[PDB]
Copies of this chain bind each other. A is one copy, B any other.
Amino acid sequence: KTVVVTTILESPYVMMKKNHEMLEGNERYEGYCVDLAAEIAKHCGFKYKLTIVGDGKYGARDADTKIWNGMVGELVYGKADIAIAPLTITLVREEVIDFSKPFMSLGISIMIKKGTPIESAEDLSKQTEIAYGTLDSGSTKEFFRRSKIAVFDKMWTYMRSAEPSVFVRTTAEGVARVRKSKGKYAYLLESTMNEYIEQRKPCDTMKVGGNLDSKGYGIATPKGSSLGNAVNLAVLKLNEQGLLDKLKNKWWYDKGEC
């Protein structure tokens, strides 16, 4: 009866509360997606258990094993009933899981340390002094891996073979690498996160250029899941009444520091 919700620790979507070690269950977490799960759960009338993805990944299909990892894997293999997280709706995932209409719109963007002489993807692609990468097992990397668009194909060719590896295991590590590389590392990630980090101390990073592509985050459920149909309508409802915009302001700007 209790719906298992898989998610991933990613600020400001899901964060441990400062005093989480004294709390149990869902109360240990806070954030935009934790607030969103709370809303969906009560408006849809069900009990749920928030569970952090074991491997801490969003989800990609291994070429060798053909196995899905991350949150996508938890849904594909029956470990979770719904994923409420900043999970990008993409063709390859849509073939194996169901997504609700987008609860948030965004795009791939470039994060640089302030002062870095880069203003766009074209600039990055036509130079080597500034290394750049993205998150492993995420949609951004798969976007670049499968892209045949000139500029993006060139960036992928560079990234897939760059040494040291330009890929990071977590967004936190990518941001930390941008902050500690003295302008020599640019990080490709979704605009929403880029925007979030831009407003967090030490305020030493910035989003440059426009978005490279346009995507959306949706709540995901196993293919042909009964719950998915209802959740999709619940998300549409929450959006129309301004709850999602309200949540965005609360977690991005009301808590900003720059």
Contacts and interface: CB of A to CB of B under 8 A. Distances in A.
A236 B146 contact: no
Nearest to A239: B214
A26 interface: no
A124 to B, nearest CB: 18
B105 A236 contact: no
Interface in A76-103: 89-91, 94-95, 99, 101-102
Interface stretch (A12-20, A44-52, A62-70, A240-248): A240-248
A237 B89 CA distance: 11
24 contacts: A89-B101, A89-B236, A90-B236, A90-B240, A91-B233, A91-B236, A91-B237, A91-B240, A94-B236, A95-B233, A101-B101, A101-B218, A102-B105, A102-B216, A143-B240, A146-B240, A149-B242, A213-B239, A213-B240, A213-B242, A213-B245, A214-B239, A214-B245, A216-B216
Top-3 shortest CB links A-B: A105-B105, A91-B236, A149-B242
